[PDB]
């Protein structure tokens, strides 16, 4: 037929290709590195604060 290139599993938990996961894991950085600049430099709110307009005079 087509080919044998991988056999199935009886729940012996098949093996990976070893370039399958590493090539992916470099994209586990792109969320954890690109999350860098969140708190640097930005705070929970970069706003300025309303100073309670006391001068009703």
């Amino acid at each position: 037929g087509g080919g044998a290139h991988i056999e199935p599993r009886y729940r012996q938990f098949p093996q990976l290709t070893r370039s399958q996961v590493i090539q992916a894991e470099f994209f586990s950085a792109t969320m954890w590195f690109w999350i860098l600049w969140r708190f640097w430099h930005d705070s929970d709110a970069v706003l300025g604060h309303f100073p309670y307009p006391d001068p009703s005079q």
């Binding site: 199935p8 599993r9 009886y10 093996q15 399958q20 090539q23 992916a24 894991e25 586990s28």
Partner: protein, 101 residues
């Protein structure tokens, strides 16, 4: 079916990273993609003549945005493997991995 799924890693290393990125992103965008989309709404138009119900109503829907995700994450990516034997899974697929990436 969300039954008979199993856990996060059985020969699905890359695709399960695609879920937990996106399915995180849709949750209110902490630094991610739509950080300018859902986030710039309830913080802007929320100062207006709003019906004082949608404020109650909408922001509550924001909650379920978590349990939307985490449910289909935790039955598929979390629990013990459950599904009949002879499972052939192969993720090495040039015509697929090319697409997600």
């Amino acid at each position: 079916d969300i039954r008979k799924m199993g856990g996060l890693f059985k020969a699905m290393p890359f695709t399960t990273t695609a879920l937990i990125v996106g399915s995180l992103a849709l949750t209110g965008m902490p630094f991610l993609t739509g950080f300018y989309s859902k986030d710039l709404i309830i913080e802007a138009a929320n100062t207006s003549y709003t019906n004082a119900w949608a404020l109650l109503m909408t922001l509550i829907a924001t909650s379920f945005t978590a349990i939307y995700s985490t449910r289909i994450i935790f039955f598929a990516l979390l629990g013990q493997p459950r599904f009949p034997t002879l499972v052939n899974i192969n993720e090495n697929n040039p015509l697929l991995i090319n697409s997600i990436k």
